[PDB]
Amino acid sequence: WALEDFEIGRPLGKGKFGNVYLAREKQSKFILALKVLFKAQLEKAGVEHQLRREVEIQSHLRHPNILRLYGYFHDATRVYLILEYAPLGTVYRELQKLSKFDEQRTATYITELANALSYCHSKRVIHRDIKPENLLLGSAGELKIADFGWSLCGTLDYLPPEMIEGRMHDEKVDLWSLGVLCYEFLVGKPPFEANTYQETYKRISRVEFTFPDFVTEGARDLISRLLKHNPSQRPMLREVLEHPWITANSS
Numbered sequence: 001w002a003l004e005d006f007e008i009g010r011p012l013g014k015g016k017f018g019n020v021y022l023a024r025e026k027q028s029k030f031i032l033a034l035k036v037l038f039k040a041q042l043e044k045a046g047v048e049h050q051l052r053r054e055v056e057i058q059s060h061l062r063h064p065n066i067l068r069l070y071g072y073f074h075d076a077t078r079v080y081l082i083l084e085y086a087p088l089g090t091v092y093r094e095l096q097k098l099s100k101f102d103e104q105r106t107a108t109y110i111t112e113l114a115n116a117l118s119y120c121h122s123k124r125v126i127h128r129d130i131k132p133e134n135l136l137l138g139s140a141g142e143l144k145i146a147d148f149g150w151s152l153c154g155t156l157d158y159l160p161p162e163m164i165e166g167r168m169h170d171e172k173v174d175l176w177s178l179g180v181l182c183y184e185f186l187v188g189k190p191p192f193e194a195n196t197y198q199e200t201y202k203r204i205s206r207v208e209f210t211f212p213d214f215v216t217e218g219a220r221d222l223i224s225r226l227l228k229h230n231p232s233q234r235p236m237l238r239e240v241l242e243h244p245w246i247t248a249n250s251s
């Protein structure tokens with residue numbers, strides 16, 4: 001491709017590294033989104049290596065609930081990412097507007113996500129980023145994950161013990177990362193949010209989390225079944241999809 005192959009639109013967002021204005025291939029008159037990343041930035045931080053990788057990975061990653069990555073090119077100074085356009089914005093935002101999601105929307109979201117993760121695990125790719133910020137919304141309020149470069153302990157809030165503890169972790173993490181989310185969904189905030197980075201592992205690794213006077217108990221267990229110190233003690237994919245909670249409020 002070529003930067004001339006498309007018509008640029010307003011800036012969808014911002015980025016320390018690069019930008020990403022609305023786009024449109026001039027042929028298809030088709031709407032897009034071009035995540036252009038700078039050089040100097042992909043260079044000011046050994047990440048040229050961190051690129052190509054995900055690049056080649058999403059660059060195949062064909063799933064509804066996985067923001068597709070049509071193509072990529074790159075000129076002297078910069079590089080460009082040609083990707084699926086997600087109109088309804090970020091769940092984070094959606095999540096900061098309605099305070100907390102209901103049960104249909106949050107359970108359903110979780111099952112959407114799960115499968116996106118299934119097709120992932122199958123094709124052996126353990127994501128690791130997922131949280132409101134790296135999850136987008138399509139035409140039908142459908143979900144889309146987008147794990148790439150870009151620009152409140154939120155940093156840790158999401159990580160699983162096995163990692164913040166520097167230990168070894170594998171596939172079993174996407175389940176933990178899947179617990180939190182479902183929680184922050186039904187609540188408004190993560191389950192391990194606390195003032196200091198310190199006062200957090202304390203709650204994360206120690207797995208110190210409480211429920212508000214209302215969350216269904218069917219959650220209270222689907223979740224307690226999604227967050228556990230022991231990575232091998234957690235439900236594999238199926239289970240949630242097959243959990244008494246997903247099914248029912250969902251889809």
Ligand SMILES: Nc1ncnc2c1ncn2[C@@H]1O[C@H](CO)[C@@H](O)[C@H]1O
Nearest residue numbers: 012013014020033084085086087089
């Ligand atoms: N494909 C996309 N669909 C919708 N919004 C997007 C897309 N890519 C990036 N954005 C927006 O651009 C911002 C910067 O990446 C994000 O916070 C998000 O709002």
